[PDB]
Amino acid sequence: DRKIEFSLPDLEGRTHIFKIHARSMSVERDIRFELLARLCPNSTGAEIRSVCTEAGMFAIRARRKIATEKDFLEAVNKVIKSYAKFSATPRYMTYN
């Protein structure tokens, strides 16, 4: 009788999702998450959690016990940009 459909969260959804999946992890207490929700335009709740797990994996590549801002910024390029685009990033000069 009822057709409930699930869509992608626009921006306010994703900023709430990052605060769920990254509250229980050792991070820097001054980072912002709205900049991270920009860089995941067409993403799901599973893809957002994969960024949160991967950013801590960069902290074990180095020798740290807290996550920095550039830990998440490399994780976005590892998850999304390594598979979503390869022609638009180097040859980008049509858009700035």
Binding site: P41, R91, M93
Partner: protein
């Protein structure tokens, strides 16, 4: 999925047929170019003569007017139309306005002619990218570049072709803020840059310089062999 048209958009806002034209640029031979104090220089690689042809009809470096040069990539057919059209505009500008043609004016003509050539259906865009180098506009050295989308743009050191990402990363760690005076030093920068060729045979480099006052000076494979010798002379300090 959906591309097969230059007028349709993607669901995330792209023009894939325009983006596929830049993929045809990466099948071309690399050509670099820097500007200096007075002498501008540009060089090309991958000559690869095939034992049975004349080599004066395979030239990749041409002059549009008396004080502006041209180097390109992509496919050879579409470059010949753009070169022959740009010679008309840089000559008809002189007739309508009695000045010589600036290096900035001819790049807007090439970009705008490639602009309207992308918009209408049934018009396959140019799959070439070009380097326009000229120290023409009142003693000032400049170099620009183009793009198959039709965006003219200015760099200070440039690389294109099959393997531009290595050379452009090489020049960022090499182009000093110290301006390369004693212009054979600036020519030796290009030969050091073109030393990272796809095979680096040594005798496959065709460097062409311009001292901003004379005409084009095509270098011979005896003067360029002397500059390849002094590059190995500085390499002896590694031991």
């Amino acid at each position: 999925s959906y591309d097969r048209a230059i007028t349709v958009f993607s669901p995330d806002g792209h023009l894939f047929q325009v983006e596929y034209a830049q993929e045809a640029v990466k099948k071309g031979s690399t050509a670099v170019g820097v500007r200096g104090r007075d002498i501008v220089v540009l060089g090309v690689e991958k000559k690869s003569v095939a034992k049975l042809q004349d080599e004066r009809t395979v030239r990749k470096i041409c002059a549009l007017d008396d004080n502006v040069c041209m180097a390109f990539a992509g496919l050879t057919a579409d470059a010949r139309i753009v070169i022959n059209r740009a010679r008309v505009e840089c000559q008809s500008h002189r007739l309508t306005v009695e000045d010589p043609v600036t290096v900035e004016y001819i790049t807007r003509y090439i970009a705008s002619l490639k602009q309207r050539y992308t918009q209408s259906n049934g018009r396959r865009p140019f799959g070439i990218s070009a380097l326009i180098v000229g120290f023409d506009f009142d003693g000032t050295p400049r170099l620009y570049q183009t793009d198959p989308s039709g965006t003219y743009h200015a760099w200070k050191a440039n690389a294109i072709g099959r393997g531009a990402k290595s050379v452009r990363e090489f020049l960022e760690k090499n182009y000093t803020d110290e301006a390369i005076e004693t212009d054979d030093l600036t020519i030796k920068l290009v030969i050091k840059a073109l030393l990272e060729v796809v095979q680096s045979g040594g005798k496959n480099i065709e460097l062409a310089v311009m001292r901003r006052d004379q005409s084009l000076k095509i270098l011979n494979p005896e003067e360029i062999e002397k500059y390849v010798a002094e590059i190995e002379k500085e390499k002896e300090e590694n031991e």
